[PDB]
Design a protein around this nucleic acid. Structure first.
Length: 74
DNA sequence: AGGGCGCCTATAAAAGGGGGTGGGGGCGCGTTCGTCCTCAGTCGCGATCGAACACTCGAGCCGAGCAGACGTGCCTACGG
């Protein structure tokens, strides 16, 4: 977070251009918002923890539905 | 209308002031730069609150022991 705020708006603008951030966020260029967006993009937690639980539950549930209903002869 | 005369051209020199023109210097103004102030954001430190663990007390459950009661076997006493 330190060096991202050391980026001195202009180089952070060029970095947001490099990552592929849309031109609206580059255009507004409030520097705190820019550095929060570039920290988020360089990251790209409790809503992900429960979503990964739901994803793991859904995968095996769908897999169990497919195997035990299949009429494939093994 | 035309000859003679006045004036222009050229040459030297001075004297002094006045006027004209070009260049430089001085003055004043505006612009630019630097510094300071203010706001926002971030990090560090201290205090307070919540959670987790440990200790203590009590209650319940299980096991063991003893006592009571009846069967059965043996011995004695009583009755025929």
């Amino acid at each position: 977070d330190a060096d991202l705020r050391r980026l001195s708006l202009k180089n952070a603008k060029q970095l947001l251009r490099k990552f592929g951030v849309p031109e609206e966020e580059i255009k507004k260029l409030s520097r705190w918002e820019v550095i929060d967006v570039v920290r988020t993009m360089s990251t790209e937690s409790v809503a992900e923890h429960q979503e990964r639980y739901k994803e793991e539950c859904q995968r095996i549930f769908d897999l169990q539905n497919k195997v035990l209903s299949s009429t494939e002869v093994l």
